[PDB]
Design a protein around this ligand. Structure first.
Ligand SMILES: [Cl-]
Ligand SMILES: [Cl-]
Ligand SMILES: [Cl-]
Length: 171
């Protein structure tokens, strides 16, 4: 019965050069159809890379998750500031009439994945953040329902995800 979006890492600790996979997971978001998210990371410490290993550019979209994967004319766009460590992206179904008719809303799952290469062994956070670009954000998140309306209330935003609180580093 708790509704949430969370940044979930596959690793708590990661050595230099390792990949840390950040899964953006929703739970119990009624009639979910899409989102706009604004993620922040420290670009001295982590570098976003595709599932093929290639560095994100200013336009690279996060990787696919386990939901938002159906042929409802998905619209995906990203704008990333790699110097500041900001990933702003939107992923949403457009063919909403058809999605509603299928009557099987994607309320729980991984909306997207962002992989990060560890540049430096330092405790660091992957967060969602409010931004002047997204006046409707709730802690950097905008969730949509299958009528195309924002889901304006009733969910937690569980973030930041922290890597390397503990480190394998002799000291
Ligand atoms: Cl679907
Ligand atoms: Cl909102
Ligand atoms: Cl929202």
């Amino acid at each position: 019965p708790t509704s949430s979006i969370e940044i979930v890492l596959d690793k708590t600790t990661a050595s230099v050069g390792e990949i840390v996979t950040a899964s953006i997971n929703i739970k119990n978001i009624t009639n979910f159809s899409g989102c706009q998210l604004n993620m922040k990371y420290d670009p001295a410490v982590l570098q976003p890379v595709t599932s093929s290993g290639v560095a994100y550019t200013k336009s690279t979209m996060p990787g696919a998750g386990t939901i938002l994967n159906s042929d409802f004319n998905l619209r995906q766009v990203a704008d990333n500031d790699l110097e500041k460590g900001i990933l702003n992206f939107s992923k949403a179904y457009v063919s909403l009439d058809d999605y509603r008719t299928a009557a099987a809303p994607e309320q729980t799952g991984t909306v997207a994945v962002v992989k990060f290469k560890v540049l430096k062994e330092e405790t660091s956070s992957i967060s969602f953040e409010d931004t002047t670009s997204v006046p409707n954000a709730i802690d950097g998140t905008v969730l949509f329902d299958w009528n195309g309306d924002r889901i304006q209330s009733g969910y937690s935003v569980i973030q930041p995800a922290v890597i390397n609180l503990d480190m394998i580093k002799a000291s």
